[PDB]
Amino acid sequence: VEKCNLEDSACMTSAFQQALPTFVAGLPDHGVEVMDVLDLDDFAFDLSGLQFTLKEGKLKGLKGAVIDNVKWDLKKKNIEVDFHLDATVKGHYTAGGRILILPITGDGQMKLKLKNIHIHLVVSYEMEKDAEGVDHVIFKKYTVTFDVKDNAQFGLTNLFNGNKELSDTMLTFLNQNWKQVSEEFGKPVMEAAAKKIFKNIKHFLAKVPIAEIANV
Ligand SMILES: COC1=C(OC)C(=O)C(C/C=C(\C)CC/C=C(\C)CC/C=C(\C)CC/C=C(\C)CC/C=C(\C)CC/C=C(\C)CC/C=C(\C)CCC=C(C)C)=C(C)C1=O
Numbered sequence: 556v557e558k559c560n561l562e563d564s565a566c567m568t569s570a571f572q573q574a575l576p577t578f579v580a581g582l583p584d585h586g587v588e589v590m591d592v593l594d595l596d597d598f599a600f601d602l603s604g605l606q607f608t609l610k611e612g613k614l615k616g617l618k619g620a621v622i623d624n625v626k627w628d629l630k631k632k633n634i635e636v637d638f639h640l641d642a643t644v645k646g647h648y649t650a651g652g653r654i655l656i657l658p659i660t661g662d663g664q665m666k667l668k669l670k671n672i673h674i675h676l677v678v679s680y681e682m683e684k685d686a687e688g689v690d691h692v693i694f695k696k697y698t699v700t701f702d703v704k705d706n707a708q709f710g711l712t713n714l715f716n717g718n719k720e721l722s723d724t725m726l727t728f729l730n731q732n733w734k735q736v737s738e739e740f741g742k743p744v745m746e747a748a749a750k751k752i753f754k755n756i757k758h759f760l761a762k763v764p765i766a767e768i769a770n771v
Pocket residue numbers: 556557559567570571574575578607614636640642648649650654659667669672674676692699701703707709711736737740741742744745748749752753756760768769
């Protein structure tokens with residue numbers, strides 16, 4: 556890793572950028588799972604009238620993320636990371652209920668393409684000495700917000716029992732109302748990914764002395 560003074564944001568931004576692809580490829584012997592393609596645990600939500608499930612979920616694109624800024628605040632003991640990427644979410648979905656003003660049913664495969672999604676991550680940490688006297692950054696909590704800035708496209712198979720007219724109408728509807736759909740339903744999907752990524756970064760930093768990857 557590129558070593559930085561922690562409050563040198565330009566350095567930290569580059570250091571996160573240069574490490575990211577290698578980190579998200581996974582470090583299996585160290586217990587760090589692959590994060591591109593990231594396997595999502597099975598999840599479901601019931602929000603705004605939509606009942607949705609995703610199994611075998613996959614998130615592609617983190618390897619290609621662009622780090623916009625890293626601000627490590629030693630006083631507050633928080634780290635703010637702003638980044639963006641194109642991503643895809645795939646998996647076996649089910650849908651029921653309604654999407655906004657249209658009824659929906661489906662059970663099939665999904666390919667959701669997200670263009671220029673911006674993510675704002677805040678993490679709280681503590682610097683802790685382990686039983687052997689070695690200092691580590693220990694991540695505690697996080698928050699994430701998102702904004703899909705360019706567009707999102709929805710590919711869903713076997714909507715409406717295979718009915719092409721209804722399926723075409725729904726896919727058109729989703730793509731037309733992509734921003735609203737992202738604001739209604741993005742949070743649970745983001746969380747399925749973020750909880751896994753956070754656990755992996757936390758684990759990695761708990762086992763790598765802070766002195767090995769940063770300057771005091
Ligand atoms: C010493 O300094 C340090 C380093 O060196 C400087 C390091 O390298 C490192 C490690 C290396 C880096 C820190 C790597 C860190 C990696 C980071 C921060 C990446 C973080 C990843 C995020 C937390 C999560 C990312 C999540 C995503 C991209 C998923 C986003 C998806 C979203 C928002 C979904 C949007 C949804 C929609 C549009 C619609 C959803 C619709 C539906 C679900 C329904 C579909 C429609 C119906 C009808 C079926 C550390 C830790 C360090 O401290």
